[PDB]
Design a protein around this ligand. Structure first.
Ligand SMILES: Nc1ncnc2c1ncn2[C@@H]1O[C@H](COP(=O)(O)OP(=O)(O)OP(=O)(O)O)[C@@H](O)[C@H]1O
Ligand SMILES: Nc1ncnc2c1ncn2[C@@H]1O[C@H](COP(=O)(O)OP(=O)(O)OP(=O)(O)O)[C@@H](O)[C@H]1O
Ligand SMILES: Nc1ncnc2c1ncn2[C@@H]1O[C@H](COP(=O)(O)OP(=O)(O)OP(=O)(O)O)[C@@H](O)[C@H]1O
Ligand SMILES: [Mg+2]
Ligand SMILES: [Mg+2]
Lengths: 164, 257, 257, 257
């Protein structure tokens, strides 16, 4: 038996605006989990493999976000801030990137998927929807392990130089 | 009444420092500083598992509010024919890591990942002769790929199991042997046990030549038997209303064994 | 503390440029340009893994501004009872081309796209006998399909596995042997370990006849034991405040073996 | 201490060049060149085994960079009731390969592979009569299939076993016989022991008629007894502060035989 340890996981702190797909992706690298493994631990089954793709066709319910909150130690009201606000239409096909800000905070911000967003206001730069050199479309944000293009291996921080 | 608690001290378990225990603790510290794997061997009633418990307790975990703990020494007893998923499940559970389900390949990766950052220095495996033959590959991997010493603990069956694979024999070649009680050491032990463990309303005077004759034939030097014979005789004396172990009931108990 | 800075050095591992390492590297290169598969055999403490690893680092993967890294040499150690997917996943992740859930045909189609384009000239499989017998179908496939040399590294058992399948025995027929040290070569190596590894504040003079008696008995020619015994004796000596290994401390260590 | 060192010297072995051993080495070298199988016979204390070990160390393994060694002479000694698997097991270990689990056909097929590639010219089997009668089929097989001189070494009983099998006797008819010492040869040899083996501080004069009668009756011409008796007489005398051996002290020792 254990000598007086408290039950634990490699918890992670969320960044100031990352998407739920990106956060779950980091959580399941801090702990080595598969997408269906994290869904099974949370008790919500195969649901997590939709959310990592932004397949929010039926939206994340209060009861499902609370189930994830019991794993990841973030309350349901802070998990809701990683999803679009009520009636803010997102798009889940083109994954998009600022890249200039990815040097200030290495994350996929949820706001880059809003249908109303076309330029990052912190930097006044046009948002990217493909790698500026090889034209490859970005992987889903849960898979942003390297923080670079998967085809030509150019860092996302260097795509700051190639945009607008 | 007073009589009811007294079964509990007798029945209750305790740890008594002995030369044999001290010898291991210092040797293991050499192995833990040096990051050298090794094996401990000896007969099954020499009290090997207990010495390893006593060692674990001397190095408590450190825990902060948020990040995961430092735990220097891990102790596990595998089940019979323990396979790879079962070994990784035990390493993971002794740390109380919350994740419980997984593929064998997922537990492998996850175990390596909880030994890292958690800062483990030594892994002790008891009745290591229970390991299913293919799981020694996962142990050789833990030992080479992390700066973690591995200490296999077992009987002479452990060796016969090791000698069947050159790859395993060589990583685990160094070892220490747990021996039996004899001569003055058996006598001094008996005396310690009377003062430190039995504590009866009246001394049982065990070091007397006539009582040591009865204990030596009955116990044949195993610390296991000595403890069991003495406690059984003490409880059985107190329940008969005597204030000490009686030579008559020490003889009766020693007749069963 | 000066004492602490040093024990943490002696705890760690290092590489010494022995004749056996130079002999392997000069052999593997022939095979690389010739693009031919082969295997390396020898006893488990001869340092096969180290000599192969050291080779892998002589050829840093290269990078231009556009296309992916060119990766001439891959080294992998597989898991025990390694399936087809487990082999492909570990090849693919070494090349850092991460891959999703797929079935086994999908792992194979991706294994070929990542081995193509990206220049790969040689694959090295450590502990090759961890492979399940069917996986060799995948290993041969790769070796014949792409101009990639495949090297199988292992103990005598590896050949017991290979000689079961005449299909495999023929692609991997050529071989090299790692061997134990002896004679003048053991003595030169001991003198190298003293000035190269141990670096103690005054000399211990380990090539002396009296010390080579102790080392030759204690190590039996394995470079593994020689490296282990000397680190263990140096750490033990410094913890006692001795400026050197001495004959008695080297015997107190060697007696654990 | 001086006496301690002389005990620690005289309790060990040595090799003296003698006519019998020079005769064996010239004879075996002819059989290694011509590849004919043969046997060495003689009484049990003639030193056939020291003569064969002295031969092996004149033909040590010739090791190249990456191949297995060339091993001109392989010398093995079987255990009692040696079967077909135990013979291959020892041949395989002597060349430093590890033997793994399999069936009889596998040990044989593997034995022929390690005998091939590795240059092997001669196989010496000591105490040949420990072989089970069927194993001779495998000994002949090798001796006919590969360019190998098999030497069987043994006592007169060996021939009593061999004459039970027409097939074997005829492969192994050619022989050298060891004999006993006599006359001038026994006398000359005693002086070689005094100058090369005994190494005590003054001449013991063992070649005088009065001392040769003692040794002749005591030793009956066997080099074994001569060695054993002069070592005991040297040891015993040094402990009593003599610089030599004398009539009474050597009779004191001889009277034990
Ligand atoms: N240091 C000790 N102090 C007190 N009792 C001890 C000590 N060591 C062993 N014992 C006694 O030994 C008995 C249990 O034996 P233990 O389980 O330690 O043996 P073991 O050699 O580890 O067994 P095995 O090898 O079969 O698992 C108990 O009665 C316990 O009190
Ligand atoms: N070339 C070398 N230079 C310096 N030290 C070495 C070298 N080879 C081995 N050692 C030392 O001896 C140890 C054993 O070497 P290594 O682990 O590479 O053996 P191996 O033959 O690959 O083992 P196995 O075949 O059992 O897997 C190393 O950990 C290191 O301390
Ligand atoms: N030529 C020699 N040079 C040095 N010492 C020798 C020599 N011959 C014999 N001796 C010594 O005398 C002993 C005689 O035993 P030896 O080794 O000759 O046995 P053997 O007769 O070959 O054995 P077996 O019983 O198998 O026939 C040796 O062990 C060694 O100590
Ligand atoms: Mg135990
Ligand atoms: Mg290795």
């Amino acid at each position: 038996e254990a000598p007086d340890v408290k039950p634990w996981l490699f918890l992670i702190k969320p960044y100031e605006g990352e998407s739920l797909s990106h956060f779950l992706g980091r959580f399941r690298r801090a702990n080595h989990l598969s997408a269906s493994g994290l869904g099974t631990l949370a008790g919500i089954g195969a649901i997590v493999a939709r959310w990592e793709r932004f397949h929010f066709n039926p939206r994340p319910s209060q009861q499902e976000l609370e189930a994830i909150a019991s794993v990841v130690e973030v309350d349901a009201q802070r998990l809701a801030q990683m999803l679009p606000p009520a009636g803010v239409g997102m798009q889940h096909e083109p994954i998009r990137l600022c890249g200039a800000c990815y040097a200030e905070s290495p994350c996929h911000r949820i706001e880059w998927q809003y249908k109303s967003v076309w330029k990052c206001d912190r930097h006044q730069l046009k948002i990217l929807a493909k790698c500026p050199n090889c034209q490859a479309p970005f992987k889903m944000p849960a898979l942003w392990e390297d923080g670079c293009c998967h085809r030509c291996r150019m860092p996302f921080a260097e795509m700051a130089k190639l945009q607008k | 009444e007073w009589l009811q608690a007294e079964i509990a001290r007798l029945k209750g378990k305790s740890i008594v420092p002995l030369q044999q225990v001290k010898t291991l603790h210092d040797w293991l510290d050499g192995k833990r500083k040096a990051r050298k794997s090794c094996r401990v061997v000896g007969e099954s009633r020499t009290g090997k598992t207990v010495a390893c418990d006593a060692y674990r307790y001397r190095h408590k975990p450190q825990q902060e509010a948020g990040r995961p703990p430092t735990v220097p020494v891990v102790y596990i007893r595998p089940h019979q024919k323990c396979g790879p998923k079962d070994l990784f499940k035990k390493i993971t559970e002794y740390l109380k890591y919350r994740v419980t389900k997984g593929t064998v390949s997922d537990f492998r990766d996850r175990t390596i990942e909880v030994l890292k950052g958690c800062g483990v220095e030594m892994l002790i495996i008891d009745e290591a002769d229970r390991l299913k033959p293919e799981t020694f590959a996962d142990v050789r991997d833990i030992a080479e790929d992390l700066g973690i010493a591995v200490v296999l603990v077992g009987t002479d069956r452990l060796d016969a199991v090791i000698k069947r694979d050159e790859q395993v024999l060589e990583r685990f070649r160094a070892h220490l042997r747990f021996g039996k009680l004899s001569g003055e050491d058996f006598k001094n032990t008996v005396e310690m046990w009377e003062q430190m463990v039995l504590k009866l309303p009246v001394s049982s005077n065990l070091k007397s030549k006539e009582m040591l004759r009865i204990l030596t034939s009955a116990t044949e030097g195993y610390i296991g038997r000595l403890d069991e014979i003495l406690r059984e005789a003490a409880i059985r004396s107190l329940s008969r209303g005597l204030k000490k172990i009686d030579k008559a009931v020490l003889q009766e108990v020693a007749k069963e064994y």
